[PDB]
Design a protein around this ligand. Structure first.
Ligand code: BCL
Ligand code: BCL
Ligand code: BCL
Ligand code: BCL
Ligand code: BCL
Ligand code: BCL
Ligand SMILES: CC[C@H]1c2cc3[nH]c4c(c3C)C(=O)[C@H](C(=O)OC)c4c3nc(cc4[nH]c(cc(n2)[C@@H]1C)c(C(C)=O)c4C)[C@@H](C)[C@@H]3CCC(=O)OC/C=C(\C)CCC[C@H](C)CCC[C@H](C)CCCC(C)C
Ligand SMILES: CC[C@H]1c2cc3[nH]c4c(c3C)C(=O)[C@H](C(=O)OC)c4c3nc(cc4[nH]c(cc(n2)[C@@H]1C)c(C(C)=O)c4C)[C@@H](C)[C@@H]3CCC(=O)OC/C=C(\C)CCC[C@H](C)CCC[C@H](C)CCCC(C)C
Ligand SMILES: COC1=C(OC)C(=O)C(C/C=C(\C)CC/C=C(\C)CC/C=C(\C)CC/C=C(\C)CC/C=C(\C)CC/C=C(\C)CC/C=C(\C)CC/C=C(\C)CC/C=C(\C)CCC=C(C)C)=C(C)C1=O
Ligand SMILES: [Fe+2]
Lengths: 48, 42, 250, 304, 281, 57, 48, 42, 48, 42, 48, 48, 42, 42, 42
């Protein structure tokens, strides 16, 4: 059993509930965590 | 659309960074002149 | 003749070799099609040649391989994902249409020919091969299904000559309608056969042979292929079949 | 006596079935050998018939007399007693004329004796039996591929006692005779030419022998696995693609990453056989009058 | 990616426990439940050849050296490059080989072929592992093994390969070459076999399964069938592995001396004990 | 005896678990044993068990 | 449901609201923004 | 359940901390000059 | 049985009854067992 | 047939010129004349 | 000579009644002329 | 359902639809920059 | 089932004890402790 | 029939201009009399 | 039952002793401790 057009599955309305909460905020739970995590890595230890 | 949201979105970011970071840890372990406790040796 | 000489005809000509070979290996199947019937995204770094001469073994006419690749045989799958890569799923029962494990294709109606003037495969009742004379003889033996239950009695052999090796165990039902089943998938322990591929309540799903003598090539694909049909699927998910699928040795 | 019907494998015996008749002969095929039904419920159980004449009573007889030529140089040292003969059934030894006589057949029966006779009867034991993997390959109308891996096989035989040690002026450059003798020559061409490792012709002659357990370690497994469908008949699967050619054309594509065909798998099997003793044909055809050393060849081409 | 008749075979499952959690087709290549594991092992071990390069002195694949641990350190480990990095590639490569030989079983339960293929790479884990888990384990430590390279273990197979004298003398080895020379004896024919059916001389009919008992019987006299050469071709190449492990299970742990010191227990017999004869006399 | 679904049962006292399980399914396990779990531990398990009391000097 | 011929798929707008909406995540943040990653590179340290 | 509970984190994370701890053991138990358990006699 | 939304599954609130005892408390006592060990390892004996 | 379109220029033709790059690069960067990367300091 | 009667094999339930029966009852008269010679070799000759 | 004889495609007019975008102009600026980013190298450094 | 008796258990009773007897006697047919059979010589 | 053209000039004869181009290019570079392009150092 | 009678009691009962006895009379012909027939001089 399958639907017709765009897009499935899915799943209107899940363009802003499934593909933005664990997809765009993934670029936040690791990308923004890198902002504070890297502030003590770039100097350890390229400058010995 | 398509792909996986209740499947391959919490398992495409758990063995993917571990397959890009922790395997990358080995090359900065390939140093023994740097290295974060080998400095005592060199 | 020389120290460094013959090797520079080896990394050049014999390196023009895996380019000449991999194509003779990528004939059947190619050219590439997608998942409906359509010119595919590519072919490969070893592009496919247009077929050459293949004079047929029994004057069967003209067929050139790489050959049939298109969508002539019936295909039906209910798609769960639209992008290429993720598997497909049967509509009804996966043992109905023939999608997934049980695999076949539509072939032309002619029994495999060998030499003398007759088909490749025949039973012992027709090709009077080797009979029974002295002593006790085990022809006519009971069988057990994958559900660990009686299914039918195999009472005849399908003999061979050039390769001297029987091929099929003709399972005749009480109805009289015969059901067919291959050879390298069976194991008899003692007095009664025990099958582990198909249950005793799924044998009519394999249709019958219209001729008890003819072994056409259209019909050597499912009879030995439906056994895989219940090798992928059978049987989810809890209880006595789990103690019949996992573990084991042979 | 009757013939059993063991519980499903299965088998029914074959009676009086010779084969084909077009170009061969069948009268010389005198008798179908007595069938050793060695519980032939696995493979087969059939003997005879075969081709007979003088394209045949020459390889046996020259095999024989080559076979006879080295064996009496095993009885030569024994002491004329059969006890020592099996005690040194291998420790006995035999070689051609001295490295200071060589080409000269003028060596008596005393010293450099029984190498000129065995290699004389061998020279009609494999050059009329290559004329039967190449002629009986036409006894019906077939190809000759069977003797195209046998014309690059008696090619490593076309350096070891033919082409090296005859235009090199030495028979001691041709291989000693028997069971133990030629193994103080498989560790003699090795101390001498500087270890044949840096010699990537003998060495890459080995790179076509470690690969025939990479093509046949799976061929007898996989065509024993697609058999539950019907791909054991290798003559109804090529052009008429069978249902054992759709249980195989995906596997190695999915696995290691390239599939073949049912005409295709016999074209890498014999492109890892016609090059076993060919790269080593060239790998004992260059270990002579080029650079005697391969340690002093492995410092001039290999890092340069 | 898929062939023209690969429309139907595309079905999920196969994997052990959890679901289709890992079983996605990437290209022609099958990336199953042992797939992102072999992506894990592959992208981790190619640099284990490039690790012993900044230390040993050779980045080039010519003489990269991750030597086996020292002969005398015990049941623990080693130095760094001389055994430690050696001990790192130990469960990276052997972690991958069976992230693949049971991922083949993720293509054998999926359909329904014979379980005989995930079985012939298993002898590749019965001559290699006759070098890590078997011999080095007992007589002391991991020091009784070889460097990983392409060349280093060559002049290790040569120079440190006369330590049992002359190895042709070894009877487990001899007969783990006697299955390694007949290896290619039943392939130079079998390979020409099914080319000369379809392509005879020119324009001639294709052959049938009864022209195999008028060619090979017209050859050497034996004909165990048409599927009796995929059951004497697997009798050629797998067995050059565990009769070679045999003279690597008996060679160094029981008889670390010469194995040319082996062929003098054939003359010590009361029949011909006090009486020499040929060659020896 | 049946839900028509699979091939086995739920609970109850008789009819079931009286002669299933310990009968038919994995009966080959012990027959395969007796030479594998017995013929490969007479020089390995006994190899590191005597190292216990005697090696206390 | 089965599919037909060229060029499903394809095709629209599961190629325009999907494949057009997933592909350009590798032809911009690695094509034009990599030139911003070039910023801390194009003089460190080719010029001595 | 976003991820699998009785499947991915009852023994599969048990070979996640185990896949890290021991591959580095033969780097820290090793090393040509640390030991402090082997070099006590010589 | 499965539902609809995110995570579902989920399976709200099976996202806060099983991602809590062994996900949080499993990794927080994997952080209460790992950090502590270091405090007998950092200096014994990388300094030599 | 023979050669198609949308699959080569994404992962294959991308490593067909990169392969053709390093078979030119790994030759002209080592000759006792050129360099242009190391020879810029001394 | 084996275990019991027609037919064997045999047998249902089996195994819980065969390989348990070939390691005690057939040893019941072996270990009847065995344990006697074991107590005679608890003192000769272990302690030399 | 699929296609017919050689070639299809083909075909007129389907040849210049999927074989003239990233193959005609996809290998034209690749050649332009192969003269554009080569003329600044024609002079450096074949000359010292 | 799956273990044979008309063939494979008639070897488990008939000669399994004879083997586990005399084959273990081979080594201590000449031993420097137990003896008891080659103590006698004079 | 028996052989091909849309596969022997579009991808075969088009690589027959690269297989034969560079081979002797470095055979006449290995032999030291041409060189011909190295105008830098001198 | 479970073994053939006229192939392990009549004439195959002669290969459980004929092989057992003659091999026991071939070990102690090289040993000069027994012999019992080789010395006939005195
Ligand atoms: C180029 C270097 C040397 C050399 C290097 C080696 C090395 C290394 C090996 C041999 C081995 C052998 N060589 Mg040689 N050998 C050479 C090239 C040849 C040529 C040839 C020129 O065509 C021939 C006919 C032979 C002949 C032989 C066989 C007798 C033997 C086993 C080969 C095998 O695997 O087939 C097996 C299948 C067959 C059908 C061949 C039939 C021969 C029988 C079956 C095997 C003989 C075993 C033994 C000697 C018989 C003892 C029986 C007693 C009565 C108990 N060699 C040259 C001269 N060869 C192997 C060996 O074990 O030597 C004794 C071995 O390891
Ligand atoms: C001393 C700091 C080291 C360093 C050692 C590491 C290690 C180890 C890792 C990172 C990783 C990352 N580093 Mg860093 N990193 C450096 C070099 C760089 C440079 C640069 C242009 O020089 C940049 C832009 C970055 C930025 C980044 C991120 C791209 C990435 C973190 C997750 C992610 O993919 O997003 N690093 C310097 C030289 N980097 C992580 C990664 O690889 O992503 C999974 C990671 O494991
Ligand atoms: C220090 C040790 C050296 C070394 C020392 C040597 C020496 C010395 C030799 C080789 C040679 C070879 N080495 Mg090396 N080699 C080394 C490493 C190895 C290793 C490895 C450890 O990986 C292996 C597996 C091998 C094995 C090989 C082969 C690849 C090659 C010989 C091919 C052959 O024998 O076919 C031969 C098969 C034939 C000629 C076909 C037979 C044709 C004849 C005419 C037909 C007669 C058949 C007859 C009738 C049969 C009778 C049948 C009866 C009816 C029963 N070497 C190391 C580096 N090696 C040999 C060689 O030639 O170098 C390339 C050689 O002399
Ligand atoms: C004095 C010289 C001795 C001698 C020196 C030695 C030494 C030393 C050795 C042998 C060994 C062997 N010798 Mg010897 N050998 C002699 C001459 C010969 C001759 C000959 C023709 O003269 C032959 C044919 C042989 C052949 C043999 C075999 C019996 C045996 C190797 C078994 C094997 O390779 O499988 C085993 C297969 C493997 C180990 C591979 C494991 C498979 C793995 C899992 C796959 C690897 C994947 C890879 C990492 C990935 C690459 C793929 C890419 C990704 C594409 N020897 C003489 C008599 N020989 C070896 C041996 O017996 O030990 C087992 C050995 O060490
Ligand atoms: C003035 C000399 C320039 C230069 C002259 C060229 C020319 C000409 C070409 C490139 C090309 C390339 N250069 Mg540049 N390049 C230089 C030296 C380098 C060095 C280095 C080792 O310093 C590196 C890593 C590179 C990197 C690269 C690749 C990204 C690119 C090849 C792509 C391909 O697949 O073909 N260049 C110096 C800085 N390079 C090829 C390219 O892709 O076009 C830009 C090309 O035609
Ligand atoms: C003090 C040492 C005793 C002794 C200690 C034992 C013990 C204990 C047992 C045997 C048993 C037996 N001994 Mg005792 N045995 C002795 C010396 C020998 C010698 C020898 C002459 O080297 C041999 C070949 C044997 C072998 C035998 C078998 C005849 C018999 C086992 C029957 C069977 O087939 O199972 N013994 C001396 C006389 N022997 C087994 C038996 O069945 O008892 C009779 C048994 O349990
Ligand atoms: C008796 C068994 C014979 C055999 C059988 C066999 N080999 C097989 C197979 C079979 C059935 C396969 O199915 C599989 C295959 O893909 O077909 C070719 C394979 C195979 N045999 C291979 C190689 C191989 N087999 C060899 C030998 C043999 N194979 C034996 C002769 C040899 C030699 C000459 O000894 C080699 C080199 C591979 C091409 C392939 C194994 C595919 C595989 O399992 O890949 C997993 C590997 C990774 C995911 C990489 C991770 C590993 C690390 C990252 C690095 C590893 C470090 C290590 C030191 C590598 C160094 C290699 C060399 C420098 C030694
Ligand atoms: C590509 C390399 C591989 C290869 C290929 C290859 N080998 C081949 C061939 C090919 C193509 C054949 O065509 C030919 C063949 O027919 O195979 C069965 C052969 C062959 N390779 C063989 C062996 C062989 N293969 C080898 C290996 C290899 N061969 C590689 C693996 C080697 C090595 C390693 O050297 C050997 C020695 C033979 C099985 C066969 C050669 C057939 C032949 O030439 O024999 C002629 C017949 C005789 C000599 C008969 C005489 C018999 C005795 C000499 C006399 C004593 C017995 C007699 C019965 C006395 C009793 C008296 C009676 C009258 C009662
Ligand atoms: C179409 O049909 C046909 C084909 O197809 C195309 C063919 O290819 C072929 C041709 C193919 C062949 C002829 C291949 C056939 C090969 C065989 C039948 C295999 C035969 C192998 C042997 C005879 C080797 C046997 C070796 C033995 C017996 C060695 C003895 C064993 C030992 C010494 C034990 C080893 C153990 C040891 C040493 C332990 C050591 C322990 C301590 C030291 C302690 C034919 C004829 C054909 O008709
Ligand atoms: Fe084959």
């Amino acid at each position: 059993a399958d639907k017709s057009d765009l897009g499935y599955t899915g799943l209107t309305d899940e363009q802003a509930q499934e593909l933005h909460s664990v997809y765009m905020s993934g670029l936040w739970l690791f990308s923004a965590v890198a902002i504070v995590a890297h502030l003590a890595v770039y100097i350890w230890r390229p400058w010995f | 659309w398509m792909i996986f949201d209740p499947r391959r979105v919490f398992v495409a970011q758990g063995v993917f960074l571990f397959l890009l970071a922790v395997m990358i840890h080995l090359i900065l372990l390939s140093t023994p002149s740097y290295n974060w406790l080998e400095i005592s040796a060199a | 003749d020389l120290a460094s000489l013959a090797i520079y005809s080896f990394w050049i000509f014999l390196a023009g070799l895996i380019y000449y070979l991999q194509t003779e290996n990528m004939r059947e199947g190619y050219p590439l099609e997608n998942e409906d019937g359509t010119p595919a995204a590519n072919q490969g770094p070893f592009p496919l040649p247009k077929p050459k001469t293949f004079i047929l073994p029994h004057g069967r006419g003209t067929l050139t391989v790489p050959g049939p690749e298109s969508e002539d045989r019936p295909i039906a799958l209910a798609r769960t994902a639209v992008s290429e890569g993720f598997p497909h799923a049967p509509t009804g029962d996966p043992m109905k249409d023939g999608v997934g494990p049980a695999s076949w294709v539509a072939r032309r109606d002619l029994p495999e020919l060998d030499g003398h003037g007759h088909n490749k495969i025949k039973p012992m009742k027709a090709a009077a091969g080797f009979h029974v004379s002295a002593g006790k003889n085990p022809i006519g033996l009971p069988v057990r299904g994958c559900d660990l239950e009686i299914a039918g009695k195999v009472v005849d052999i399908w003999v061979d000559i050039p390769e001297q090796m029987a091929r099929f165990l003709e399972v005749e039902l009480k109805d009289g309608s015969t059901r067919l089943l291959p050879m390298q998938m069976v194991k008899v322990q003692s007095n009664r056969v025990h099958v582990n591929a198909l249950s005793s309540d799924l044998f009519a799903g394999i249709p019958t042979i219209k001729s008890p003598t003819e072994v056409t090539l259209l019909e050597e694909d499912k009879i030995c292929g439906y056994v895989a049909g219940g090798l992928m699927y059978a049987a989810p998910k809890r209880k006595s079949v789990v103690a019949a699928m996992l573990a084991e040795y042979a | 006596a009757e013939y059993q019907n063991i519980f499903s494998q299965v088998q029914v015996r074959g009676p009086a079935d010779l084969g084909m008749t077009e170009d061969v002969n069948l009268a010389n095929r005198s008798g179908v050998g007595p069938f050793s039904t060695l519980l032939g419920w696995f493979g087969n159980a059939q003997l005879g018939p075969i081709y007979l004449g003088s394209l045949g009573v020459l390889s046996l007889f020259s095999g024989l007399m080559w076979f006879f030529t080295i064996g009496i140089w095993f009885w030569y040292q024994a002491g004329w007693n059969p006890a020592v003969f099996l005690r040194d059934l291998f420790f006995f030894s035999l070689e051609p004329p001295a490295p200071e006589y060589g080409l000269s057949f003028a060596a008596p029966l005393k010293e450099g004796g029984l190498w000129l006779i065995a290699s004389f009867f061998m020279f009609v034991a494999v050059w009329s039996w290559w004329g039967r993997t190449y002629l009986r390959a036409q006894a019906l109308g077939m190809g000759k591929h069977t003797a195209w891996a046998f014309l690059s096989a008696i090619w490593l035989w076309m350096v070891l006692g033919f082409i090296r040690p005859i235009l090199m002026g030495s028979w001691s450059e041709a291989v000693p005779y028997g069971i133990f003798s030629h193994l103080d020559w498989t560790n003699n061409f090795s101390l001498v030419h500087g270890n044949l490792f840096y010699n990537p012709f003998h060495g890459l002659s080995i790179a076509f022998l470690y690969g025939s357990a990479l093509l046949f370690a799976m061929h007898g497994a996989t065509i024993l696995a697609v058999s539950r469908f019907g791909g054991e008949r290798e003559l109804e699967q090529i052009a008429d693609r069978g249902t054992a050619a759709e249980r195989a054309a995906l596997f190695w594509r999915w696995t290691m990453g390239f599939n073949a065909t049912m005409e295709g798998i016999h074209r890498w099997a014999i492109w890892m056989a016609v090059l076993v003793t060919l790269t080593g044909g060239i790998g004992i055809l260059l270990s002579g009058t080029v650079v005697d050393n391969w340690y002093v060849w492995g410092q001039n081409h290999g890092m340069a | 990616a898929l062939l023209s008749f690969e429309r139907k075979y595309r079905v999920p499952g196969g994997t052990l426990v959890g679901g289709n959690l890992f079983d996605f087709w990437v290209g022609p290549f099958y990336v199953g439940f042992f797939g992102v594991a072999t992506f894990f092992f592959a992208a981790l071990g190619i640099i284990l050849i490039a690790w012993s390069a900044v230390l040993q002195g050779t980045w080039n694949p010519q003489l990269i050296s991750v030597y086996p641990p020292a002969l005398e350190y015990g049941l623990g480990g080693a130095p760094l490059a001389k055994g430690g990095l050696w001990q790192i590639i130990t469960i990276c490569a052997t972690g991958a080989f069976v992230s693949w030989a049971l991922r083949e079983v993720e293509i054998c339960r999926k359909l329904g072929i014979g379980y005989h293929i995930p079985f012939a790479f298993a002898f590749a884990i019965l001559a290699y592992l006759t070098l890590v888990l078997f011999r080095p384990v007992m007589m002391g430590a991991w020091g009784y093994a070889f460097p990983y390279g392409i060349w280093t273990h060559l002049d290790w197979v040569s120079n440190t390969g006369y330590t049992y004298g002359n190895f042709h003398y070894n009877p487990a080895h001899m007969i783990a070459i006697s299955f390694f020379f007949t290896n290619a004896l039943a392939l130079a024919l079998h390979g020409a076999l099914v080319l000369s059916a379809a392509n005879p001389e020119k324009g001639k009919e294709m052959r049938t399964p009864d022209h195999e008992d008028t060619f090979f019987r017209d050859l050497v006299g034996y004909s165990i069938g048409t599927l009796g050469i995929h059951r004497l071709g697997l009798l050629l190449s797998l067995s050059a592995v565990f009769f070679s492990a045999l003279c690597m299970i008996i060679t160094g742990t029981i008889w670390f001396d010469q194995w040319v010191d082996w062929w003098q227990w054939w003359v010590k017999l009361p029949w011909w004990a006090n009486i020499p004869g040929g060659i020896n006399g | 005896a049946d839900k028509t679904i699979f091939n086995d049962h739920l609970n109850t006292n008789p009819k079931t678990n009286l002669r299933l399980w310990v009968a038919f399914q994995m009966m080959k396990g012990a027959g395969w044993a007796g030479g594998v779990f017995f013929g490969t531990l007479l020089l390995i398990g006994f190899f590191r068990v005597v190292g216990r009391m005697l090696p206390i000097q």
